[PDB]
Amino acid sequence: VTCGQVDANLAPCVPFLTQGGEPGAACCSGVKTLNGNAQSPDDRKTACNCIKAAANRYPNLKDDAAQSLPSKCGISLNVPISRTINCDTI
């Protein structure tokens, strides 16, 4: 996994993550794809650091949307979308 792959997977989620509402089907599909790449501990740590940079990338990101994205998409997300996540604990 690479940070560009992660960015591409999270792109459809930016409207939901910065404006609220509901994640679209495209957003949930991208998150599902990225979750499928974060299997191994090293994949999980790398994807986590990429997701952290991406989260800090988007302005006025709403943490309620980030926290509720896994339940709104039906995913047990192995890498949380946080600006402040310590990826070593993943």
Ligand X SMILES: CCCCCCCCCCCCCC(=O)O
Interface with ligand X by CB under 6 A: which residues? 38-39, 76-78
Residue 78's binding partner out of its own copies, ligand X, none, with CB under 5 to 8 Å set by partner kind: ligand X
8 is a contact residue toward its own copies (CB under 8 A): yes
Choices 45-53, 56-64, 67-75, 80-88 (CB under 8 A): range interacting with its own copies: 67-75
Q: How far apart are CA 8 and CA 47, in angstroms?
A: 12
Q: How far apart are CA 43 and CA 40, in angstroms?
A: 5
User: For residues 78 and 82, which CB has a smaller minimum distance to ligand X in the complex?
Assistant: 78
Nearest to 36 by CA among 26, 25, 47, 49: 47
The reply on whether position 33 binds its own copies by CB under 8 A is: yes
User: If contact means CB under 5 to 8 A according to the sort of partner, which of ligand X, its own copies, none does residue 56 touch?
Assistant: none
